[PDB]
Every structure is written in structure tokens, then in C-alpha cells.
Design a protein around this ligand. Sequence first.
Ligand SMILES: NC(=O)c1ccc[n+]([C@@H]2O[C@H](COP(=O)([O-])OP(=O)(O)OC[C@H]3O[C@@H](n4cnc5c(N)ncnc54)[C@H](O)[C@@H]3O)[C@@H](O)[C@H]2O)c1
Ligand SMILES: [Ca+2]
Ligand SMILES: [Mg+2]
Ligand SMILES: [Mg+2]
Length: 318
Amino acid sequence: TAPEVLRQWQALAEEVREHQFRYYVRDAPIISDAEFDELLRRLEALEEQHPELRTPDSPTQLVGGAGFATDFEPVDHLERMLSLDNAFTADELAAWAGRIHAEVGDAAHYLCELKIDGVALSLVYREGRLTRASTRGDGRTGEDVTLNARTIADVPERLTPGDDYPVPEVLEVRGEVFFRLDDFQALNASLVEEGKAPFANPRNSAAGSLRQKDPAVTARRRLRMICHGLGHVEGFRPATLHQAYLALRAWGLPVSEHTTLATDLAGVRERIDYWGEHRHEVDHEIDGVVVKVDEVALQRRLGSTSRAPRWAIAYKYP
Ligand SMILES: NC(=O)c1ccc[n+]([C@@H]2O[C@H](COP(=O)([O-])OP(=O)(O)OC[C@H]3O[C@@H](n4cnc5c(N)ncnc54)[C@H](O)[C@@H]3O)[C@@H](O)[C@H]2O)c1
Ligand SMILES: [Ca+2]
Ligand SMILES: [Mg+2]
Ligand SMILES: [Mg+2]
């Protein structure tokens, strides 16, 4: 029934939007990430089954966080800041790799990174000086948390020039802000002893600690950061992500030591199996592995959707 299917879509879309608000705006979700993911998959399946439900501002097409207002100063990113599509099974991973191979061939190599379950942050360095830091927001416009980001010890005020890597005129770099697991638990126990509510989990603790109107609150908390992507850059043309990370390292920016470069899907699957067994050994919350086409020229050819790059996928663990 066209009437009945539409009401079903409306209820599900409204529910998805409610939880996106609770997660992205309040850092206070009321259901688990797994439950949220199933709701979003249900919405997508409803749209695939009934094409008349495809609507441009559905949660299935937008960066989570779109459509909400907040108390922070809005600031436009220099380049779109996107989400990631997911693989929850081996079949979904292999379907992605096949699609890569069908478009760009065997030339693609695959960078395999730990997917940090933190809060996204975008930093802008102008002539080597940190001038702005922003949350993802709706992917185009973020929230100004520059003063909060300056308090993070991992985030430098100034880039250190290298002889091999001159400082770019403009560097927009993206990464994850997070707590180590012991610090996450210590903050929750500290909050509970003060009578306040603890955070649900490491992600919301990090996001809530970063998104503070008073940056002194952020300063008291041992936030960490790892850079894992590039936005707009001027005066720097890395040919590959792994070469970009060499420059970021040289400049004094934090990069993960756990990343590996695989030549093919078999190599990628070996690394995903490895972290399935060893992710409990990482001192911060990991919700998967991000697989990325390493060659920047191939990323540009693969492109991106309205909400995620086509050249990367997040494999998510159970
Ligand atoms: N529980 C709830 O009510 C609720 C509501 C909305 C969303 N969520 C959760 O939010 C997530 C989906 O939203 P999302 O758009 O933030 O997606 P995501 O976290 O699944 O993937 C995209 C994000 O991965 C991050 N990331 C971490 N490590 C990375 C790496 N090495 N390389 C690149 N990026 C890396 C980036 O910040 C990027 O924004 C899911 O985990 C979902 O369950 C939960
Ligand atoms: Ca979302
Ligand atoms: Mg409700
Ligand atoms: Mg996340």
C-alpha cells in the first residue's frame, strides 16, 4: 500500500534523525551503535524496495549531523568532510574490492588503518600555524572548536618544516579525537564520584569533552588525536596517502603507527583478520578497519558520493 509504505518510511526516517540528533548534537545516544546501524539499514532497504521513497535529504544520502543547529559558531570546511560506507561481512568487503578493481584495476594498493571510535576533527594550518579546528557538522559546515583543539597535547600549534617537506601554504587535515580506554574509565569514575552522569562509551566521552563551550573543560581532559585524511591543501601534492603520512609525521602531526599497506584484497583480508584477533590490545576503542585506495590519482578517479568516498570502506567488527 503506497499510503502504508510512506508512513512506514516517515516513522523510520524520523527515528533515524532523532538518534542522529542525540548522537551528533548531544553526544548522548539512547540506543547502541549496532541498533542504530540496523535502523539505518532498514531505512535503506525500504528505499531500495520502493524507489518512490528515494528523497534527496533522506538520512541514507546525507552526512550524519546534517540538518541540525547547534550552540557553537558555524564554520565552513575548505573541502567536504565525509562519512564512510560500511562493510559488515566478507561479501560486502569483496563487493567493494571488486568494484575498485573493476574501475582502476590491479594498480590500486590498499592502506589498512584502524578505525578509531572517536569524534571527527578538522584542522586548518595556514603557513604552518593552526588557525581553525572544527567538527564535521553536516559535512560542509562544522562547529568551531579551535580553542578546545589547541588544548590537545597531540595537536601542535605550528608545523615543523622539513627539508623534504616544506610547510604547505594551506593544510586542512582530518583526524580522530579520542581517549585512551583507561583515561575514558577514569573520567567516568571521576564524573560518577561528583554525582554527574558518566558518558555512554569512549566515543561520546571524547565528543562531549571536545564540544565544550568552555575550553578549560577540554584542557583538563587527556584527549588524544590521530590524523587520518586530507581536506584542502595548497602547496603540497602527495601522490599517495602513505607519502602524505610521511609529510604529516615530518610536520609533527600525530599519525597512527598501526597502519599497513596491502597490495591486494588478500593482503587486506589478512590485516582485517589480524585486528579481529588483536584489537583488544590497542589502548583505545576500535570499531573496525578502514581500507583506502592509496594512490591519490585513483581516489580522484573513483570519486565520492554525497556522503562518503568511493575509494574507502570501513570494515566493521561484530
Ligand atoms: N547510537 C546512536 O544512536 C547513533 C546515532 C548515529 C550514529 N551512530 C554511529 O555513528 C557512526 C556512523 O556515523 P559516521 O558518519 O560518524 O560514520 P563512521 O564513524 O562509521 O565512519 C566515518 C568516520 O570514521 C572516522 N574514522 C575513524 N578512524 C578513521 C580512519 N582511520 N580513517 C578515516 N576515518 C576514520 C572519521 O571521523 C569518519 O567521520 C556509526 O558507528 C553509528 O553506529 C550512533
Ligand atoms: Ca549517522
Ligand atoms: Mg523517541
Ligand atoms: Mg565513528
